[PDB]
């Protein structure tokens, strides 16, 4: 009951899924073969970790996940990797030809040939759930599959599973690791098409993660592996309330109630601390106050923007590890006196707190130090529209010359879909301005 | 034999309800297995009011446990007195209510409400002369608020001539789980105005402040708040559970406390409340003065900002009845400005010889004060701050509600505030 199905789309979605499921197994004591010697409920159960893992009679704990990509080489690494025995072959779906960084190919030309099979596999997972709560969809904005196929999948999921909640982890493009000039096109197209079908989306700015890895972990040139291990810690903090239970544990859907004031305004800003190397952590024990203070440093945000130049509509603190409410309250009191936190006049100014007691863990051979306590802040700030503005500006520069548009029209798309998508983004930016203006 | 049927709904309702049954089971000499092991016949004289007698001289609470998710009721069943409840009286769903009044009242709650009414009917049919119902719930969530008020309406339909009484926990931004609590509370308060005879207004803001300022609890938990509520609930039901002359049943209590049908929202209070001194003996003057102090009241309203329509005071323990009268008439005559002149002799006093477990003397206060409008004013202000911008409404319109229902609920509670102000100036 309360099961969650994860869907990982394209290279970024799949590789981040690899990092997340590896971390989940370590957090829950699940071996690479799927066995879990602590779970005495063989073949089933209603434990908290059963929201993300089903169980076979042979004692294997199987991720409630589907991996999908339009070319096979990334998922082939899952099929032969360390955690190959975790998944059954039917959960790993590949085509032969990818979307070539072209939204039109992922949504139409190539995606249409595999969408029905993907839905059949998702249905197989859903049929095993006694009370399915919804979906978590991992994908890039910039790739042709991550953009085009995700939006097709989200559209089809709304038809097949009505209003059942769909949450996103979306990889926002960064020039330091980008592979396509047309990523602004793909980002605007998928954001427009998915907007009405997503209940909540956590954007992850690759440049913000890149900068955190360079600054806080002393990594000269972060790789996807560096980025994804940090991303999985943030994803784990967000999903920890679903996979663990406790008396201070606040469910994610309760945070979601505070985080989404209007359907379209559903993009929380995530901030995570502490991100520290083992050589630096060996001296310091970072307190509740220190990690809480770090949540209001813009350098620790998952999306580059300036919340000091926006207004807050919600502020959530998700703690994990050795944390008690007494220390949280004292830390929050200090923050309110010394920090720039302005709310809109129509919402309460308090902070919503959840504490999950199992301490965080790290994958062996990683760069993050294992700490006794961590925190993820989820805030709804109007400042996150700055990320849309940067994308919208790159879109406008290219589209004014119709640069690269022929690649999309050649696959059946019309120029009207570009302008329709761009106008929706303009209205979204104006929506963020409107929500932040004082009442009368 | 005047039986009361008890219902507890939602997280807050079941947590406070479980603690209430723990407390009064100890007072009546009932152990967690349902066996009586006390030493006084006064414990059994009116035990029928809250307990059924099963085979083997065992006592089973006449209690029904309701929730739209199994979590809290699993913890109740695995609790201290969890095995005393009738297993068929656990009625629960799986989807939850998402802190959403519409889900409790119109969608998720409507799927489950008939099963609760089946258990209510079963308990009512085994009553020699049912007097009414008491409901424990919060107004700020979804199940206790939305489904709880749905249950009240359907119970009134099936038992229109019985008394409906609630212990209703009012939300406060200081002890808040979600921002939509003013929405859920405003929708619920209108239901209570129409469909209850007596409602104890328990404000989480007052409970927290008592724990922090008076009890010197630096970090109060919900368990600390529920400890105050269970002690208060035991006090206000003493007249129902032990032999006595005053407010001995729900209807006589309502006739004494409610001069106008919609103004039935009471401010409860308890004394003593002190930091851990603890073994120090308490005197009648000290009980009386504390019981009437705003710091000891649980609705976060200043009674000197309004006027008392009616007051019920219950003293527990061995004490001088003559001395009780002197101090009760003392505070009454010295502060006559705060009692309405057009209801003569509107303060009634009862005394019960059996005190609570750990105290030699205690006092419980039940006030029908026009200052309770401050509570409803606070909720209305918080409601309007969001509704002006239609904030968070999609959670409710997604369940089929229209904005007109919110407008009507807003007008209804402002009307209630205006009604209190009418009699405060009278
Ligand atoms: C069954 C229980 C729960 C329990 O406690 O069992 C685990 C119960 O509460 N029953 C009692 C009862 C009271 C009224 C009506 C019906 C029953 C009673 O008979 C009893 O036992 O009171 C308990 C309650 C105390 O905790 C404590 O309060 C708290 O710290 C506290 C913290 C948070 C919320 C509320 C209280 C208590 C107070 O609260 C009370 C109620 O008196 C507070 O100011 C009151 C004055 C008391 O002198 C003072 C200070 C005590 O120091 C005393 O030594 C003691 C007693 C006499 C405890 C320390 C054990
Ligand atoms: N953080 C992170 N970003 C990634 C990863 N892989 C790709 N990206 C980003 O994703 C964008 C490119 O999209 P991809 O996911 O590689 O493309 P795709 O979804 O497979 O679509 P096609 O290959 O065009 O069919 C660029 O912005 C990359 O920086 C990854 O493993 N981690
Ligand atoms: N005093 C007290 N208040 C509670 C408790 N649990 C929740 N609340 C309050 O109840 C409201 C939330 O409603 P809740 O009962 O959890 O939702 P429900 O399960 O849908 O009925 C908020 O105002 C909380 O502050 C509790 O154990 N004690
Ligand atoms: Mg690819
Ligand atoms: Mg709750």
Domain range for B302: 266-374
Closest C-alpha to B365, from B289, B258, B268: B268
A47 and A119 inside one domain: yes
Q: Which of B105, B101, B161, B171 lies closest to B133 in space, CA to CA?
A: B161
Say if residue B238 is in the same domain as residue B97: yes
When scoring B15, B145, B184, B391 by the number of chain A Cβ atoms within 10 A, the one with the most, hence best to mutate, is: B391
Q: Which two tokens stand for residue A18?
A: 């690899």
Give contacts of B179 with chain A, Cβ < 8 Å.
257-258, 314, 347-348
Domain CATH code at residue B393: 1.10.287.600
Kind of pairing, strands B198-203 and B265-271?
Answer: parallel
Task: Report the C-alpha gap between A427 and A429 in whole angstroms.
Answer: 5
Q: Taking the CB of residue A361, how many other CB atoms lie within 10 A of it? A: 17
Rounded CA-CA distance A345/B78 in Å is 44
d(CA B295, CA B289): 11
Which residues of chain B neighbour A350 with C-beta distances below 8 Å?
173-174, 176
Given the structure tokens 């993820």, which residue do they identify? A376
**Measured distance between the N- and C-terminal CA atoms of chain A, rounded to whole angstroms:** 45
In terms of phi and psi (left: phi > 0; alpha: psi -120 to 50; beta: otherwise), the region of B100 is: beta
Residues B24 and B160 in one domain: yes
**Tokens standing for residue A12:** 């970024």
CA–CA separation, B192 and B340 (whole Å): 24
| Residues making up the binding site of A | 11, 71, 140, 144-145, 179, 206, 228
As a dihedral over the C-alpha atoms of residue A233, residue A239, residue A241, residue A242, rounded to 10 degrees, the angle is -140
Helix (H), strand (E) at residue A17: helix A10-28
Query: How much of chain A is helix, strand and coil, in % rounded to 5?
Result: 45, 15, 35
- Please, what is the Cα angle at A434 between A433 and A440, to 5 degrees? 135
Domain range enclosing A252: 3-259
Cα four-point dihedral sign B251, B253, B256, B257: negative
* φ and ψ of A16, to 5 deg: -65, -40
Residues A85, A58: Cα–Cα separation, whole Å: 13
Q: Which listed ligand is nearest to B99 at the C-alpha?
A: 3
> How far is A105 from A118, CA to CA, in rounded Å?
16
Domain boundary among B206, B231, B265: B265
Considering the domain boundaries, does residue A250 fall inside one?
yes
In terms of Cβ atoms closer than 10 Å to its own Cβ (0-12, 13-18, 19+), residue B57 is exposed
Segment holding A92, helix H or strand E: strand A92-94
Q: Give dist(CA A351, CA A348) in Å, integer.
A: 9
Domain count, chain B: 3
Read off the DSSP letter of residue A84. G
Query: Which of B142, B178, B222 is most worth mutating to test chain A (most A CB atoms within 10 A of its CB)?
Result: B178
Residue B43 main-chain phi, psi, to 5 deg: -70, -25
Give, in degrees to the nearest 5, the angle at Cα B334 between B328 and B337.
110
**Type and span of the H or E element at A69:** strand A65-69
Task: Indicate if B351 and B402 belong to the same structural domain.
Answer: no
In a domain, A48, yes or no: yes
Nearest CA to ligand 1 atom 14: B231
Only one residue has tokens 């049927």, namely B5
Q: Which tokens belong to A437?
A: 């203006």
Q: Which residue among A196, A254, A420, A423 is the active-site one?
A: A254
Does residue B234 share a domain with residue B104?
yes
User: Looking at the structure, do residues A254 and A305 belong to the same domain, yes or no?
Assistant: no
Ligand found nearest the CA of A142: 2
Helix (H, G, I), strand (E, B), or coil: what is residue A189?
A: helix
Instruction: State how far the Cα of B245 lies from the Cα of B224, in Å rounded to an integer.
Output: 33
Q: Are residues A93 and A114 in the same domain?
A: yes
Select from A263, A347, A435 the Cβ nearest to the Cβ of B386.
A347
**Interval between CA A69 and ligand 4 midpoint (Å):** 7
- Of A227, A259, A291, the last residue of a domain is A259
Tell me if A205 CB under 6 Å of ligand 2.
Answer: no
* Encoded tokens for B140: 């700020």
Q: What is the CATH number of the domain that holds B166?
A: 3.40.50.1440
Say yes or no: B13 and B87 in one domain: yes
Distance CA B50, CA B241 (A): 8
Residue ranges with strand state E in A142-241: 165-172, 200-205
Give CA–CA dist A63/A50, Å, rounded. Answer: 9
The C-alpha atoms of residue B392 and residue B296 are separated, in whole angstroms, by: 35
- Give the CA count within 13 Å in the CB-facing half-sphere of A431: 16
Cα A317 to Cα A250: distance, rounded to the nearest angstrom: 10
Residue A414 covered by a domain:
no
| Phi then psi dihedrals of residue A58, to 5 deg | -80, 5
Same domain, A23 and A152: yes
Q: Under 8 Å CB-to-CB from B125, ≥6 apart: which residues?
A: none
Answer yes or no: is A408 within a domain. no
Q: How far apart are CA A327 and CA A321, in angstroms?
A: 13
For residue A376, give both structure tokens.
């993820």
Task: Mark whether A254 is an active-site residue.
Answer: yes
Chain A residues within an 8 Å CB radius of B386:
346-347
With contact defined as beta carbons under 8 Å apart, do A328 and A222 qualify? Answer: no
Q: Phi and psi for B201 in degrees, rounded to 5?
A: -90, 105
A247-277 as b/e: b if 16+ CB within 10 A? eebbbbbbbbbbbbbbebbbbbbbbbbbbbe
Q: Residues A76, A20: one domain? A: yes
Measured at the alpha carbon of residue A28, what is the angle toward residues A22 and A29, in degrees to the nearest 5?
Answer: 85
The residue contributing the CA closest to ligand 1 atom 22 is B358
Q: Residue A257 and residue B95: Cβ atoms within 8 Å?
A: no
| Both tokens assigned to A109 | 């030309």
Q: Is the domain of A294 the same as that of A223?
A: no
Q: For chain B, give the secondary structure using H, E and C.
A: CCCEEEEEEHHHHHHHHHHHHHHHHHHCCECCCCEECCCCHHHCCCHHHCEEEECCCEEEECEEEEECCCHHHHHHHCCCCHHHCCHHHEEECCCCCCCCHHHHHCCHHHHHHHHHHHHHHHHHHCCCCCCEEEEEEECCCCHHHHHHHHHHHHHHHHCCCCEEEEEEEECECCECCCCCHHHHHHHHHHHHHHHCCEEEEEEHHHHHHHHHHHCCCCCCCHHHHHHHHHHHHHHHCHHHHCCCCCCCCHHHHHHHHCCCCCCCEEEEEEECCCCCCCCCCCCHHHHHHHHCCHHHECCCCCHHHCCEEEEEEEEEECCCHHHHHHHHHHHHHHCHHHECCCCCCCEEEEEECCCCCCCCEEEEEEEEEHHHHHHHHHHHHHHHHHHCCCCCCHHHHCCCCCHHHHHHHHHHHHHHHHHHHHHHHC
- The CATH number that applies at residue A331 is 3.30.1330.20
Q: How many CB atoms lie within 10 A of CB B56?
A: 7
Could you tell me if B166 and B200 are in contact, meaning their C-beta atoms sit under 8 angstroms apart?
A: yes
Distance (Å, whole) CA B222 – CA B203: 13
Q: How far away, in angstroms, is A105 Cα from ligand 4 center?
A: 12
Which of B231, B265, B299 is where one domain is finished?
A: B265
Query: Are residues B96 and B226 located together in one domain of the fold?
Result: yes
Q: E strands, A240-335, where?
A: 269-273, 312-321
> B interface toward A at CB cutoff 8 Å?
94-95, 98-100, 173-174, 176-180, 218-219, 221, 382, 385-386, 388-389, 391-392, 394-395, 398
Q: Which of B344, B339, B355, B224 is nearest to B287 (CA)?
A: B355
Residue A307: helix, strand or coil by DSSP? helix
Same domain, A101 and A13: yes
In a domain, A236, yes or no: yes
Residue that is last in its domain, among B243, B265, B287: B265
Q: What is the rounded distance in angstroms from the CA atom of residue B292 to the CA atom of residue B149?
A: 31
A215 and A318 fall within a common domain: no
Query: Nearest to residue B61, comparing CAs of B39, B38, B28?
Result: B28
- CATH number, domain of A199, equals 3.40.50.1440
DSSP-derived 3-state class of residue A172: strand
Asked whether A227 lines ligand 2 (CB < 6 A), one says yes
Least CB–CB distance from A347: residue in B94, B174, B391: B391
Give which of A348, A355, A378, A439 to mutate to test B binding, by max B Cβ within 10 Å: A348
Neighbours of ion ligand 4 (CB under 5 A): A 11, 98
Q: Which of B178, B218, B382 faces A258 most closely, judged by CB atoms? A: B178
β-strands B63-67, A373-381 pairing: unpaired
Strand order in the sheet with A373-381: A269-273, A373-381, A312-321, A352-356
Q: How far is CA B248 from the centre of its chain?
A: 17
H or E stretch at A430: helix A415-435
- The answer to whether residue A45 is domain-embedded is yes
Q: Give dist(CA B17, CA B162) in Å, integer.
A: 21
A to B CB pairs, distance under 8 Å:
58
List the one residue out of A281, A174, A294, A287 whose CA is nearest residue A218.
A281
C-alpha triplet A278, A279, A283: angle, nearest 5°: 100
What does chain A come to in residues? 440
H or E element: which one contains A290? helix A288-294
Instruction: Say which ligand is closest to the CA of A226.
Output: 2
Kind of pairing, strands A312-321 and A373-381?
Answer: antiparallel
Q: What angle do CA A53, A59, A61 make, to 5 degrees?
A: 20
Q: Find the farthest-apart pair of alpha carbons in chain A and give their distance in angstroms, rounded.
A: 64
- For residues A39, A44, A47, A48, the Cα torsion angle rounded to the nearest 10 degrees is 110
Burial of B322 (0-12, 13-18, 19+ CB in 10 A): exposed
The Cβ of residue A26 has, within 10 Å, a number of other Cβ atoms equal to: 15
Which of B222, B217, B177 has the alpha carbon at shortest distance from A353? B177
Indicate the residue among A346, A372, A387 that finishes a domain. Answer: A387
Give yes or no: residues A294 and A205 share one domain. Answer: no
The domain that holds B356 is classified in CATH as: 3.30.1330.20
**Ramachandran angles phi, psi of A249, nearest 5°:** -80, 120
Same domain? B124 vs B75: yes
CA distances, A79 to each of A32, A90, A92 (Å): 13, 11, 8
Residues 6 or more apart whose CB falls under 8 angstroms from that of B212 comprise B218, B220
**Residue A242: burial class (beta carbons within 10 Å; 0-12, 13-18, 19+):** buried
How many domains would you assign to chain A? 2
Ligand 3 center–CA B68 separation, angstroms: 14
Ligand 1 centre to CA of B300 (Å) is 21
CA atoms of A24 and B88, how far apart (whole Å): 38
A353 strand-pairing partners = A317
Bridge partners of B304, per DSSP, are: none
- Closest alpha carbon within chain A to B392: A261
Q: What are phi and psi of B421, to 5 degrees?
A: -65, -30
A254 and A298 housed in the same domain = no
B44 close to ligand 1 (CB < 6 Angstrom):
no
Token readout for A426 is: 């303009």
Which of A5, A21, A16 has its CA nearest to residue A65?
A5
Distance CA B354, CA B352 (A): 6
Strand (E) or helix (H) holding A137: strand A134-140
Q: How near does any CA of chain B get to the CA of A282, in Å?
A: 31
In chain A, the residue whose alpha carbon lies closest to the alpha carbon of B96 is A2
Could you tell me if B141 and B182 lie in one domain? yes
């Amino acid at each position: 009951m309360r099961e969650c199905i994860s869907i990982h789309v394209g290279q970024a979605g799949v590789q981040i899924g690899n990092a997340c499921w590896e971390l989940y197994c370590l957090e829950h004591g699940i071996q690479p073969d799927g066995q879990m010697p602590s779970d005495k409920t063989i073949g089933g159960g209603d434990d908290s970790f059963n929201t993300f893992f089903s169980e076979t009679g042979a004692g294997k704990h199987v991720p409630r996940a589907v991996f999908v990509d339009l070319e096979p080489t990334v998922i082939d690494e899952v099929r032969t990797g360390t955690y190959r025995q975790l998944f059954h072959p039917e959960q790993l779906i590949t085509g032969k030809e990818d979307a070539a960084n072209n939204y039109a190919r992922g949504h139409y030309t190539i995606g249409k040939e595999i969408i029905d099979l993907v839905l059949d596999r998702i249905r197989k997972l859903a049929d095993q759930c006694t009370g399915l709560q919804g979906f978590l969809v991992f994908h890039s904005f910039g790739g042709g599959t991550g953009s085009g196929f995700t939006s097709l999948l989200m559209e089809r999921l709304s038809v097949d599973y009505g209003k059942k909640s769909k949450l996103e982890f979306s990889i926002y493009p960064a020039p330091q690791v980008s592979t396509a000039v047309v990523e602004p096109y793909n980002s605007i197209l998928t954001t427009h098409t998915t907007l009405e079908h997503s209940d909540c989306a956590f954007m992850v700015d690759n440049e913000a993660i890149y900068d955190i890895c360079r600054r806080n972990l002393d990594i000269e040139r972060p790789t996807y592996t560096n980025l994804n291990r940090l991303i999985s810690q943030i994803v784990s903090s967000i999903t920890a309330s679903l996979r663990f239970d406790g008396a201070l544990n606040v469910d994610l859907t309760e945070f979601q109630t505070n985080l989404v004031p209007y359907p379209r305004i559903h993009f929380p800003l995530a901030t995570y601390a502490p991100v520290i190397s083992a050589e630096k952590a060996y001296h310091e024990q970072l307190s509740v106050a220190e990690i809480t203070n770090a949540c209001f440093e813009p350098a620790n945000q998952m999306v580059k923007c300036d919340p000091r130049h926006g207004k807050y509509m919600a502020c959530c603190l998700l703690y994990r590890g050795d944390v008690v409410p007494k220390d949280v309250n004292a830390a929050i009191a200090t923050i309110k006196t010394k920090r720039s936190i302005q709310f809109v006049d129509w919402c309460p100014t308090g902070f919503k707190v959840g504490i999950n007691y199992q301490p965080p863990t790290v994958v062996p051979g990683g760069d993050l130090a294992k700490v006794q306590r961590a925190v993820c802040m989820l805030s709804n700030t109007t400042a996150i529209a700055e990320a849309w503005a940067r994308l919208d500006h790159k879109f406008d520069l290219m589209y004014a010359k119709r640069a690269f548009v022929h690649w999309y029209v050649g696959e059946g798309m019309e120029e009207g879909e570009f302008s329709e998508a761009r106008e929706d983004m303009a209205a979204l930016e104006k929506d963020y301005e409107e929500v932040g203006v004082d009442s009368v | 034999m005047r039986e009361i049927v008890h219902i507890q709904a939602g997280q807050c309702g079941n947590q406070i309800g479980a603690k209430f049954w723990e407390v009064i089971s100890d007072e009546h000499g009932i152990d967690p297995t349902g066996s009586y092991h006390g030493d006084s016949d006064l414990q059994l004289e009116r035990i029928n009011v809250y307990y059924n007698e099963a085979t083997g001289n065992k006592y089973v609470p006449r209690a029904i446990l309701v929730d739209l998710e199994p979590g809290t009721m699993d913890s109740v069943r695995s609790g201290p007195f969890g095995q005393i409840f009738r297993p068929d009286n656990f009625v629960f769903g799986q989807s939850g209510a998402g802190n959403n009044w519409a889900k409790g009242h119109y969608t998720e709650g409507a799927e489950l409400v008939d099963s609760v009414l089946d258990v209510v009917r079963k308990e009512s049919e085994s009553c020699d002369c049912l007097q009414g119902f008491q409901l424990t719930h919060s107004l700020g969530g979804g199940t206790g608020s939305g489904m709880g008020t749905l249950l009240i309406s359907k119970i009134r339909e099936e038992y229109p001539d019985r008394i409906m009484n609630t212990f209703s926990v009012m939300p406060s931004p200081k002890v808040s789980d979600t921002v939509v609590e003013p929405y859920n509370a405003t929708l619920s308060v209108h239901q209570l105005v129409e469909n209850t005879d007596e409602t104890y207004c328990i404000d989480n803001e007052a409970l927290y402040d008592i724990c922090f300022r008076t009890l010197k609890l630096t970090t109060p938990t919900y368990g600390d708040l529920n400890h105050l509520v269970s002690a208060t609930m035991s006090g206000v039901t003493t007249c129902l559970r032990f032999p006595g002359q005053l407010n001995a049943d729900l209807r006589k209590l309502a006739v004494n406390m409610v001069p106008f049908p919609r103004l039935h929202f009471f401010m409860p209070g308890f004394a003593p409340l002190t930091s851990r001194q603890q073994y120090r003996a308490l005197t009648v003057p000290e009980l009386t003065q504390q019981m009437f102090d705003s710091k000891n009241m649980m609705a976060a309203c200043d009674p000197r900002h309004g006027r008392y329509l009616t007051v019920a005071a219950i003293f527990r323990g061995r004490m001088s009845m003559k001395e009780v009268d002197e101090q009760m008439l003392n505070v009454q005559n010295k502060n006559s400005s705060y009692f309405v002149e057009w209801i003569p002799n509107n303060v009634k006093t009862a005394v019960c010889d059996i005190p609570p477990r750990g105290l030699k003397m205690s006092a419980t206060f039940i006030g029908n004060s026009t200052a309770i409008q401050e509570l409803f004013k606070r909720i209305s202000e918080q409601f309007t701050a969001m509704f002006r911008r239609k904030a968070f409404l999609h959670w409710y319109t997604g369940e089929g509600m229209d904005e007109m229902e919110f407008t009507e609920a807003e007008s209804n509670m402002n009307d209630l505030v205006s009604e209190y102000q009418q009699y405060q100036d009278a």
